[PDB]
Write a protein that binds this ligand. Structure first.
Ligand SMILES: *[C@@H]1O[C@H](CO)[C@@H](O[C@@H]2O[C@H](CO)[C@@H](O[C@@H]3O[C@H](CO[C@H]4O[C@H](CO)[C@@H](O)[C@H](O)[C@@H]4O)[C@@H](O)[C@H](O[C@H]4O[C@H](CO)[C@@H](O)[C@H](O)[C@@H]4O)[C@@H]3O)[C@H](O)[C@H]2NC(C)=O)[C@H](O)[C@H]1NC(C)=O
Ligand SMILES: *[C@@H]1O[C@H](CO)[C@@H](O[C@@H]2O[C@H](CO)[C@@H](O[C@@H]3O[C@H](CO[C@H]4O[C@H](CO)[C@@H](O)[C@H](O)[C@@H]4O)[C@@H](O)[C@H](O[C@H]4O[C@H](CO)[C@@H](O)[C@H](O)[C@@H]4O)[C@@H]3O)[C@H](O)[C@H]2NC(C)=O)[C@H](O)[C@H]1NC(C)=O
Ligand SMILES: *[C@@H]1O[C@H](CO)[C@@H](O[C@@H]2O[C@H](CO)[C@@H](O[C@@H]3O[C@H](CO[C@H]4O[C@H](CO)[C@@H](O)[C@H](O)[C@@H]4O)[C@@H](O)[C@H](O[C@H]4O[C@H](CO)[C@@H](O)[C@H](O)[C@@H]4O)[C@@H]3O)[C@H](O)[C@H]2NC(C)=O)[C@H](O)[C@H]1NC(C)=O
Ligand SMILES: *[C@@H]1O[C@H](CO)[C@@H](O[C@@H]2O[C@H](CO)[C@@H](O[C@@H]3O[C@H](CO[C@H]4O[C@H](CO)[C@@H](O)[C@H](O)[C@@H]4O)[C@@H](O)[C@H](O[C@H]4O[C@H](CO)[C@@H](O)[C@H](O)[C@@H]4O)[C@@H]3O)[C@H](O)[C@H]2NC(C)=O)[C@H](O)[C@H]1NC(C)=O
Ligand SMILES: *[C@@H]1O[C@H](CO)[C@@H](O[C@@H]2O[C@H](CO)[C@@H](O[C@@H]3O[C@H](CO)[C@@H](O)[C@H](O)[C@@H]3O)[C@H](O)[C@H]2NC(C)=O)[C@H](O)[C@H]1NC(C)=O
Ligand SMILES: *[C@@H]1O[C@H](CO)[C@@H](O[C@@H]2O[C@H](CO)[C@@H](O[C@@H]3O[C@H](CO)[C@@H](O)[C@H](O)[C@@H]3O)[C@H](O)[C@H]2NC(C)=O)[C@H](O)[C@H]1NC(C)=O
Ligand SMILES: Cc1cc(-c2cc3[nH]nc(N[C@@H]4CCNC[C@H]4F)c3cc2C2CC2)cc(C)n1
Ligand SMILES: Cc1cc(-c2cc3[nH]nc(N[C@@H]4CCNC[C@H]4F)c3cc2C2CC2)cc(C)n1
Ligand SMILES: *[C@@H]1O[C@H](CO)[C@@H](O)[C@H](O)[C@H]1NC(C)=O
Ligand SMILES: *[C@@H]1O[C@H](CO)[C@@H](O)[C@H](O)[C@H]1NC(C)=O
Ligand SMILES: *[C@@H]1O[C@H](CO)[C@@H](O)[C@H](O)[C@H]1NC(C)=O
Ligand SMILES: *[C@@H]1O[C@H](CO)[C@@H](O)[C@H](O)[C@H]1NC(C)=O
Ligand SMILES: *[C@@H]1O[C@H](CO)[C@@H](O)[C@H](O)[C@H]1NC(C)=O
Ligand SMILES: *[C@@H]1O[C@H](CO)[C@@H](O)[C@H](O)[C@H]1NC(C)=O
Ligand SMILES: *[C@@H]1O[C@H](CO)[C@@H](O)[C@H](O)[C@H]1NC(C)=O
Ligand SMILES: *[C@@H]1O[C@H](CO)[C@@H](O)[C@H](O)[C@H]1NC(C)=O
Ligand SMILES: *[C@@H]1O[C@H](CO)[C@@H](O)[C@H](O)[C@H]1NC(C)=O
Ligand SMILES: *[C@@H]1O[C@H](CO)[C@@H](O)[C@H](O)[C@H]1NC(C)=O
Ligand SMILES: *[C@@H]1O[C@H](CO)[C@@H](O)[C@H](O)[C@H]1NC(C)=O
Ligand SMILES: *[C@@H]1O[C@H](CO)[C@@H](O)[C@H](O)[C@H]1NC(C)=O
Lengths: 737, 736
C-alpha cells in the first residue's frame, strides 16, 4: 500500500499529498480518496476534466500551478463535483478565460500569471463565499460593471500587474486588502474608495513609476507626472493600517490624506522624489501610530548633499519602530542631523544603506534610547516571484543569529581598509558587528576592538585580515561567534602564517568559521568551542606522509561537537589523523572531497557520532560489520559516490540508523542478503534516486522488501529510474510486475 | 619529407625546430641534421646521452626546460660532441649537480629551478666563453674562485639561493649581478670592488618586508634591514640599475651614490622610507635617474592627510617616471607636488592603491610633459622566475589608449556618478579610464565638457545610462568607446536600449558594446554611423532581437569588423544576415548555438576575408563555396559537429589560405574532397582533435599530405586516431 506517485503524509488528523515536480503527463488516479490537500504543481498536465478528481470527494485544497511546466485545457464544470473544495490555485497555466463551472464552496482562488483579459460575472459572481481572490499578472483589462459586488465575503482583491487604467467600481464593503500595484492608474478620486470602509490595506505602488532598477518593465507617467491622488480620496478609510505608495513619482504628500487614518501602521514611500518632503514633512504630524516608515531610494539624481535634511516633524512619529532611509545619498551624518529622532521611544531600527556616506559621527547613536539595529552597509566610511514585496527589503538587515545578541551595527561593504584607532570610539554597547567585504588588512593585536569589548557575534568575512598574533581579537572576552570566511592573507610569513593560537584565549567562543582561508600551513586548543567550519581549505597539504606535524590538528578542541571538513581536496585521510579527531563529535562533514577509501573501523573511538557526511566523494566500498563500530550513528549520507554493492546485512547492522542516503551512486541491484531482517531497525528513510537500477527479475527481491517494510520511507519514487532494459528504461522500479 | 614531430621553420637563412609540449618520451631522431635551434621543452624526456643529438652537428641552441613535465638523467659529456652549441637551457629538470662534460663553446647556460647545491670548478671553470650564467632557484656551496676563470662573464644570476654572503672572486668583466632573495644581510666595501664594469646590481629580497610576497617571506629577525656599508658602492661608477626592493630599509645613505653618476633605474619599493621621502638627502646624488619607484613604502596603520614629498625631488632633473603606489594618504594638494612641476622630462606619475579621498586636479596642469596620470584603485568621489617580482612592468594604461595623448586613469575609484566639477581644471586629456567605478551617470551631453578632446574613453564595468540621443556627443573627436559589462540601472520599457547617440559622431572608429545585456532596442531600432569601423556586440541577446530588428547593423555602412559571439544564436534569419554591412572584411559569429549556416548568402559580401564560426553546432558545408566567395582568406570552423568534408572543398575557394577544422567529428577525408583540378594557396589546415578512423580509408588523405607539403598541418601529435585499439592515441602520420 505504498503511495505512488504522490508522497502522502499525516498533518493534524488529515492526509496531504505532495505530488509536485514529478513530470506527470496527466492527473494520477492512484491517490488515496481520503486526502484533503493535493499539490500537483510543476508538472506536464495539459487537460482537466470532470473525471480527473473522481473519488477524491474530501479535497479541500487543489494546487495546479505551472502546468505544463515551461496551456491548460480546463473543461466547463471540471471542479463542480468537488463540493468541499476551498482553495484552488491555478497560476502560470496560460488560461485564456476564467474557468467556468467553479464550485460555490471556494474561499480562495488564485489565477496569477495567466492570459485572462475578461473578468466577467459568468465565472466569478456565482462564487459568493470567496475570502481571497488573486488576479495578478493577467490593451486593457475588461472588468464587468459590478462583478465583485455579489462577493459579500470578499476580504482580499489583488488586481496588480494588469493594465486597469482606473479603479474598478462597485467593490464589496467587506474588502480588507485591496492590491492595485502597477495597474496604470494615474488618477485617484474621492469616490474610488468610499464604499470600502473596512479597508486595512491599500496598495497603489507602481502607478507612475520611478524607473530605477525595476525588476519588471517600467514606463514613466509621461512628462514626469506622479499619481494624482485627490485631497479627499482617503477620507473614509478610518481602518487603514498598510499604505503602499512606492514608485509613484510623488513630489508632494498631502497631509489631508491621513486626517481620517489614525491607525496607519506601515507607510511605504520608496522610489519617489521626496527629498523636499522629508525636510518639511507636514504629513509627519498626521501619523502618531505609524510603526514602519520607508523613504528609501528618494535621492535626486546627480545630487550629493553634504548632510541629510530631516524635518523636525519627525519627532511627532511617537510610535515609530523602524526607519528605512536607503538611497538618499549624502556625504556626512552629524549628531545634529538626527536630532528629531532621538526622543522617539520605540525606534529600534535605522536603515542607512547605499548612501555613500564619507563619514558618520558615531557619537549620535548613544543618544537613541532604544536602538537595536544600525544598518550602515554599502557606504564610504574610512579608517579612524509574483508573491513578493517588489519595493521593500523584507529580509532581515542583520542576520537574526547576530542581532539576537543585542545591539547590532553593520559596517559591511564600506571603505574600511584597516581598523583605525578611533574606529569604534563613542559607540553604544555593540554586541553584533559586521565588517564584511571591507578589504580590511588590519594586523590584529588585541586593542582594535577595545571600545566595544562586548561583541558576541563578529563578522569579519571577505577581508585580508592578519590574525597570526597570539593575542588577536582577545579583547572581545565575551565573543561567541567568529566568522572569518573568505579571508585572503596579505602578510603571509613563511614560518608564521597561519598561527591560530589566538583561539585558546577565549573562554566562551562557541562557533568559529575559518572557511576558504587557504590554510595550507600552520605553525588548535579550545575548552569552549562547539562548532568549527574548516571547509575550503587545504587539509590534503596538511595531512602528508613527509611531515606528521598536523596529525593532531583539531585534537585540542575537546568540547567540539560539529566539524566541517568539506572542500579540502582530501584524497586520503591518514588513520592516525582521523583517530586524533575530537571524541565529542556528534556531527562530522567530510563531503565534497576526493576520498577513495574510508576506514569504517575508526568510528569506534567516536561513541557520540550521530551524523556522518561523506557525500560528493569517490568511495567504492562499505563495511560488513557497521554494528561493531557504531552504536549511535542516526544519519549516514553517502550520496554522489561510486558505491556499486550494498554489503550483506548493512540495512540491519546499525539499529540506531534512521536516515541512510545512497542516492546518485552506482547501485545496480539490492540483494536479499543485505535485506536480511534478523534484527529490528528504526530506518525511517532510505534515499535511492539516481542509481542505475537493473530493472530485471533481480530487483524483485528488493521490490518485495519495499512492500513489507512500509515504515522505511523512500522519497522521490519517480526518480528511482531503471537504466536497463530498454522497455523498462525511464520507468520507476515500483512500476514493475 | 614532412617534419615529425618537430615543426621546422625558416628564420634568417637558418632552420628552427619547434618541438615543445608534444609528450615526447625520448629525444627524437627524426630531426633534420641542418637545424640550428632546437626547442624540446615541456616534454616527458628522462635521459640525455652522448648519442641523443647525433648528426645534428649545427646545433647552436638547445632548450630542455621542464623535463619530465610535472628528474633528468644527463650522462657525463652528453653535449660534448656538439662543438657549435652556444645556448643551453636546462630549467626545472631536478638536476642534483651541474652537468659534467659541458661543451667549451657555451656562451649561455641556464640551470634555474634545479636541485643544485654545489657550484664546483669541475663543471663550471672549463666554460671560459660564458657570457650569461643563470643559477637561480637552486646553504649553497660555492667554490672559492669558481667564477674567476670565466673572463667573458657578463651576467651572473644567483637569486633565490641561500647564499648568506656575496661570493668572492668574481670576474671584472661582470655587467649584471643578480643576488635577489639570497639571505645576504651584510654588504661590505670589499664585496664589489673587483667588478668595476657593473651596470646592474640586484640586492632585493634581502631582509624582506613581508607584504603580499609571491614566494616564501621571512623577515630579517628584529626588524633589521640590509646592512649596506658606506663605501660598498664607491667603485661602481658605471652602475645604471640598482634594485633595493623589499630590503626593509629605513635610511638611505647618500654616500652610496657619490660615485654613481649614471644611475638610471632605482627601485626602492616595499621598504619603510616615508621619512626618507620627506627629507631625501640621497635625491641630490641622482641627477641622471630616469625611473624612481618608491611603491608600497606605507607605514602600517598610518593614514596621513597629505604626502610629504621632499624639496630635493626637484634635483631629479632626468626623472621621467615616478611610481608612488602604496604610500596611503587622504589628500593630494598642489603644494605637495610642487618639487615635480619644474622637471622637464617627468611624463609618468603612478599613484595607485593610495586610498586618496580627494585630489585637487588643477595641479596636473602645472606639469611640463605629463603624459600618464595613473590614479587607479583610489577613493576619489563625485565632483615565472624570469619576471620582475617587485616592479609593475605591464603598461599602467593600455598602449592603444595612451597613444592618443595625455592619459588619466581614474578606474576603481568611488565615482558613482560623473559630477559637474569632475573634470574641471584638468589638462587636455586624450585618453580617459573610468572603468569599474559603479558609475550610474545618465549621460546627456555635458558631463565631459571640460575635456572634450578625449579620443579613447574606457567606460567599462559601469551602470551607465546612454539612452539619451545626445549622450557622450560632447567628445567630438572620440575614436574608441569601450562600454563592456555595462549593467543598465534605469531600464525604461519603451526606451532602453536607445543607441541613437552613435550617429552624432563624425570620427568614432571602435565601439565595444559587449556584455551590456542588449535584448531590446527602440525608435531608431537600427544603428547608423558613417565612420564606425569595428563593433563588438558579444555577450548580448541577439537571439531575442532576431526572434523588427532585421536591419539592426545595416546603417553602419563603413563597418569592416563585427563580433557577434556569445549571443545565444540558434538560427540567423536569412533576411537579417543579408542586411549586414557589405563592407565587412572580418565577421565573428563564434561561441553560439548555430545549427545551420547559409553559405549562399556570402555572395553579398565580396570583401569578407575572415569568417569565424567556432564553438557552434554546425553539421554541413556547401558543395560550391567558389560560387559564393572570391576573397575569403581564413575560415575558422573549430569545435563544431562537421562529420564530412564535401567533394572538392579544399579546391573550391582558391583565395583560402587558412582553414580550421579542429575538434570536429571528421572520421576520414575522402579522395573526392582532395581533388586537385585547380591550384589553391592553402598554407595551413588544422585537424587536431578529430576522431580519425585510422583504417586503410585514411590512406587517401595520408598521400595528399606528402604530395602537398606546402599545406602546413600544425599539431601533428594531436591528430589522434580514435579507432582501432592498436592505432588509438597514435598520430595519423605514423601509419604504414
Ligand atoms: C506594498 O506593501 C504591502 C504592505 O507591506 C505589501 O503587502 C504584502 O505583500 C506580501 C506579498 O504579496 C504578503 O506576503 C505574504 O503573506 C502571506 C500571508 O501572511 C500572513 O499569514 C502567515 C500565516 O499563514 C503568517 O506567517 C504571516 O506573518 C502573515 O500573518 C504569506 O502566506 C506569504 O508567504 C508565502 O510567500 C513568501 C514569499 O515568497 C514565502 O517566504 C512563504 O514561505 C510563503 O510561500 C507572504 O509572506 C504580505 O502579507 C503583504 N502584507 C500585508 C499586510 O498584507 C505589498 O506586496 C507591497 N507591494 C509591492 C508591489 O511591493
Ligand atoms: C560560517 O559558519 C557558521 C557556522 O556553521 C555559519 O552559521 C550558521 O549557518 C547556518 C546556515 O548555513 C545556520 O543554520 C540555519 O539556522 C536557521 C535559524 O535557526 C534558528 O531558528 C530555528 C527556528 O526557525 C531554530 O530551530 C534554530 O534552533 C535556531 O534558533 C534555520 O532556519 C536553518 O534551517 C534551514 O536549513 C536546515 C539545514 O541546514 C534545514 O534542515 C531546515 O529545514 C531549513 O531549511 C538553518 O539551520 C546557523 O544557525 C548559523 N550559525 C550561527 C552561529 O550563526 C555561517 O553562515 C558561515 N558563514 C558563511 C559566510 O558561510
Ligand atoms: C630588480 O630590478 C632589475 C632592474 O629592473 C630587474 O632586472 C630585470 O629582470 C628582468 C627579468 O629577469 C629582465 O627581463 C628580461 O630581459 C631579457 C633581455 O632583454 C633585453 O633583450 C631583448 C632582446 O633579446 C630586448 O627586447 C629587451 O628590450 C632587452 O634589451 C628578455 O629576453 C626577457 O624576455 C623574456 O621574458 C619576458 C617575461 O617573461 C617575456 O615577456 C619575453 O617574451 C621573454 O620570454 C625579459 O624581458 C630585465 O632585462 C632585467 N633588467 C635589466 C636592465 O637587466 C630584476 O628582475 C629585479 N629583481 C626582482 C626580484 O624583481
Ligand atoms: C572592446 O573591444 C575593443 C575592440 O575589439 C577591444 O580592443 C582591442 O583589443 C584587442 C585585443 O583583444 C587588441 O588587439 C591586440 O593589439 C595589440 C597591439 O597591436 C598593435 O601593435 C602590434 C605590435 O606591438 C602590431 O603588430 C599591431 O599591428 C598593432 O599596431 C597586438 O599586439 C595584439 O596581437 C596579438 O594578438 C593577435 C590576435 O588577437 C595575434 O594575431 C598577434 O600575433 C598577437 O599575438 C592584438 O592584435 C586591439 O588592438 C584593441 N583595439 C583597440 C582599439 O584598443 C577591447 O579590448 C574590448 N574591451 C574589453 C573589455 O574586452
Ligand atoms: C554582513 O554583511 C554582509 C555584506 O552585506 C552580508 O553578506 C550578504 O548576505 C546576504 C544574505 O546571505 C547575501 O545575499 C544573498 O545572495 C544569494 C546569492 O546571490 C541570493 O540567492 C540570496 O537571495 C541573497 O540575495 C549577500 O550576497 C552577502 N554579501 C556578501 C558581500 O557576502 C552578511 O550576511 C552580513 N552578516 C551578518 C552577520 O548579518
Ligand atoms: C582601465 O582600467 C581597468 C581597471 O584598472 C583596466 O582593467 C584591467 O586591465 C588589466 C590588463 O588588461 C587586467 O589584467 C590582466 O588580467 C588577465 C586575466 O586575469 C591576465 O591574463 C593578465 O596577465 C592581466 O593580469 C585586469 O584584470 C583589468 N581589471 C579590470 C577590473 O578590468 C583596463 O585595462 C584599463 N583600460 C585602459 C584603456 O587603460
Ligand atoms: C545619477 C545618480 C546615481 C546614484 C547612484 C549611483 C550608484 N552607483 N552604484 C550604485 N549602486 C550599486 C549597486 C548596489 N551596491 C552598490 C553599487 F554596486 C548606485 C546607487 C545610486 C543611487 C541609489 C542611490 C546616486 C545619485 C545621487 N545620482
Ligand atoms: C594595515 C594597513 C593596510 C593598508 C592596506 C589595506 C588594503 N586593503 N586592501 C588593499 N588592497 C587590495 C588589493 C588591491 N586592490 C584594493 C584591495 F583589493 C590594501 C592595501 C594596503 C596597503 C598597500 C597599501 C594600508 C595601511 C596604511 N595600513
Ligand atoms: C471524508 O472524511 C470524513 C471524515 O472527515 C469521512 O467520514 C469520509 O469517509 C471521507 N470520505 C472519503 C470519500 O474519503
Ligand atoms: C512600544 O511597543 C510596545 C509593544 O511592543 C507598546 O506596548 C508600547 O505602547 C509602544 N510605545 C509607544 C510609545 O508606541
Ligand atoms: C545627546 O544629544 C544631546 C544634544 O542633542 C547632547 O547634549 C548629549 O550630550 C548627547 N548625549 C549622548 C550620550 O550622546
Ligand atoms: C602581538 O600583539 C601584542 C599585543 O598588542 C604586541 O605587544 C606585540 O608586539 C605583537 N607581536 C607581533 C609579533 O606582532
Ligand atoms: C562545552 O560547550 C558548551 C556550549 O558552549 C558549554 O556550555 C560547556 O560548558 C562546554 N563544556 C566544557 C567541559 O567546557
Ligand atoms: C583502519 O585503521 C587501522 C589503524 O588505525 C588499521 O590497522 C586498519 O587496517 C585500517 N583499516 C582499513 C580498512 O584501512
Ligand atoms: C652546417 O652548416 C654549414 C653552413 O653553415 C653547412 O655547410 C654544413 O653542411 C652543415 N652541416 C650539417 C651537418 O648540416
Ligand atoms: C628628456 O628625454 C630626451 C629623450 O627622450 C632627452 O633627449 C633629453 O635630454 C631629456 N632631458 C633631460 C633634462 O634629461
Ligand atoms: C601653475 O602653478 C602656479 C603656482 O605654482 C600658478 O600660479 C599657475 O596658475 C598654475 N598654472 C596652471 C596652468 O596650472
Ligand atoms: C537628453 O539630454 C538633453 C541634453 O542634455 C537634455 O536637455 C534632455 O532633457 C535629455 N532628455 C531625456 C529624455 O533624458
Ligand atoms: C571609413 O573609416 C575610415 C577609418 O575610420 C575612414 O578613414 C574613412 O573615411 C571612412 N569612410 C567613409 C566613406 O566614411
Ligand atoms: C539561403 O537563403 C536564401 C534566401 O536569402 C534561400 O532562398 C535559400 O534557400 C537559403 N539556403 C539554405 C541552404 O538555407
Amino acid at each position: 500500500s505504498r503511495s505512488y506517485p504522490c508522497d502522502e503524509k499525516k498533518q493534524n488528523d488529515s492526509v496531504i499529498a505532495e505530488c509536485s515536480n514529478r513530470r506527470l503527463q496527466e492527473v494520477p488516479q492512484t491517490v488515496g480518496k481520503y486526502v484533503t490537500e493535493l499539490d500537483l504543481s510543476d508538472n506536464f498536465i495539459t487537460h482537466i476534466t470532470n473525471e480527473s478528481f473522481q473519488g477524491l470527494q474530501n479535497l479541500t485544497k487543489i494546487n495546479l500551478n505551472h502546468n505544463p511546466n515551461v496551456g491548460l485545457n480546463i473543461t466547463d464544470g471540471a471542479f463542480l463535483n468537488l463540493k468541499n473544495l476551498r482553495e484552488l490555485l491555478l497560476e502560470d497555466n496560460q488560461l485564456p478565460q476564467i474557468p467556468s463551472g467553479l464550485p460555490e464552496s471556494l474561499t480562495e482562488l488564485s489565477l496569477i500569471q495567466n492570459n485572462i483579459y475578461n473578468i466577467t460575472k459568468e465565472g466569478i459572481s456565482r462564487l459568493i463565499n470567496l475570502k481571497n481572490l488573486y488576479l495578478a499578472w493577467n490593451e486593457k483589462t475588461n472588468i464587468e460593471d459590478g462583478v465583485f459586488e455579489t462577493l459579500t465575503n470578499l476580504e482580499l482583491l489583488s488586481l496588480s500587474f494588469n493594465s486597469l487604467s482606473h479603479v474598478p467600481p462597485k467593490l464589496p464593503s467587506s474588502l480588507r486588502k485591496l492590491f492595485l500595484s502597477n495597474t496604470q492608474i494615474k488618477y485617484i478620486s474621492e469616490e474610488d474608495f468610499k464604499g470600502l470602509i473596512n479597508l486595512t490595506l491599500l496598495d497603489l505602488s507602481g502607478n507612475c513609476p520611478r524607473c530605477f532598477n525595476a525588476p519588471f518593465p517600467c514606463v514613466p507617467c509621461d512628462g514626469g507626472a506622479s499619481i494624482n491622488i485627490d485631497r479627499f480620496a482617503f477620507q473614509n478609510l478610518t481602518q487603514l493600517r498598510y499604505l503602499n505608495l512606492s514608485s509613484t513619482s510623488l513630489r508632494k504628500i498631502n497631509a489631508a490624506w491621513f486626517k481620517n487614518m489614525p491607525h496607519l501602521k506601515v507607510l511605504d514611500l520608496e522610489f519617489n522624489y521626496l527629498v523636499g518632503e522629508i525636510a518639511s514633512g507636514a504629513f509627519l504630524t498626521m501619523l502618531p501610530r505609524l510603526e514602519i516608515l520607508d523613504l528609501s531610494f528618494n535621492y535626486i539624481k546627480g545630487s550629493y548633499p553634504q548632510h541629510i535634511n530631516i524635518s523636525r516633524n519627525f519627532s511627532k512619529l511617537l510610535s515609530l519602530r523602524a526607519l528605512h532611509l536607503r538611497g538618499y545619498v549624502f556625504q556626512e551624518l552629524r549628531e545634529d542631523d538626527f536630532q528629531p529622532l532621538m526622543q522617539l521611544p520605540n525606534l529600534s531600527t535605522i536603515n542607512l544603506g547605499i548612501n555613500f556616506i564619507k563619514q558618520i559621527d558615531f557619537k549620535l547613536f548613544q543618544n537613541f534610547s532604544n536602538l537595536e539595529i544600525i544598518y550602515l552597509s554599502e557606504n564610504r566610511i574610512s579608517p579612524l516571484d509574483p508573491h513578493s514585496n517588489f519595493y521593500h527589503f523584507t529580509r532581515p538587515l542583520i542576520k537574526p543569529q547576530c542581532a539576537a545578541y543585542g545591539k547590532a551595527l553593520d559596517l559591511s561593504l564600506n571603505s574600511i581598509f584597516f581598523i583605525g584607532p578611533n574606529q569604534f570610539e563613542n559607540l553604544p554597547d555593540i554586541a553584533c558587528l559586521n565588517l564584511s567585504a571591507n578589504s580590511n588588512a588590519q594586523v590584529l593585536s588585541g586593542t582594535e576592538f577595545s571600545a566595544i569589548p562586548h561583541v558576541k557575534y563578529l563578522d569579519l568575512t571577505n577581508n585580508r585580515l592578519d590574525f597570526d598574533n597570539a593575542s588577536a581579537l582577545t579583547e572581545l572576552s565575551d565573543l561567541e561567534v567568529l566568522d572569518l570566511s573568505y579571508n585572503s592573507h596579505y602578510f603571509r610569513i613563511a614560518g608564521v602564517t597561519h598561527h591560530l593560537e589566538f583561539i585558546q584565549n577565549f573562554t566562551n567562543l562557541k562557533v568559529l568559521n575559518l572557511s576558504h582561508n587557504n590554510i595550507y600551513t600552520l605553525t588548535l586548543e579550545s575548552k569552549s568551542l562547539v562548532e568549527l567550519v574548516f571547509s575550503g581549505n587545504r587539509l590534503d597539504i596538511l595531512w602528508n606522509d613527509d611531515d606528521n606535524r598536523y596529525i593532531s590538528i583539531f585534537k585540542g578542541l575537546k568540547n567540539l561537537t560539529r566539524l566541517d571538513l568539506s572542500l579540502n581536496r582530501l584524497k586520503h585521510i591518514p588513520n592516525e589523523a582521523f583517530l586524533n579527531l575530537p571524541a565529542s563529535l556528534t556531527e562530522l562533514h567530510i563531503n565534497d572531497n576526493m576520498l577513495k577509501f574510508f576506514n569504517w573501523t575508526l568510528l569506534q573511538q567516536f561513541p557520540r557520532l550521530e551524523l556522518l557526511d561523506l557525500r560528493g566523494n569517490k568511495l567504492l566500498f562499505l563495511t560488513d560489520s557497521l554494528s561493531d563500530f557504531t552504536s549511535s550513528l542516526r544519519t549516514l549520507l553517502l550520496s554522489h559516490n561510486r558505491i556499486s554493492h550494498l554489503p550483506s546485512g548493512f540495512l540491519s547492522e546499525v539499529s540506531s540508523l534512521k536516515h541512510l542516503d545512497l542516492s546518485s551512486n552506482l547501485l545496480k541491484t539490492i540483494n536479499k542478503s543485505a535485506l536480511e531482517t534478523k534484527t529490528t531497525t528504526k530506518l525511517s528513510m532510505l534515499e535511492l534516486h539516481g542509481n542505475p537500477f537493473e530493472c530485471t527479475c533481480d530487483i524483485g527481491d528488493f521490490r518485495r522488501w519495499m512492500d513489507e517494510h512500509l515504515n522505511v520511507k523512500i522519497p522521490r519514487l519517480v526518480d528511482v529510474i531503471c537504466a536497463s532494459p530498454g522497455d523498462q528504461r525511464g520507468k520507476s522500479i515500483v512500476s514493475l510486475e
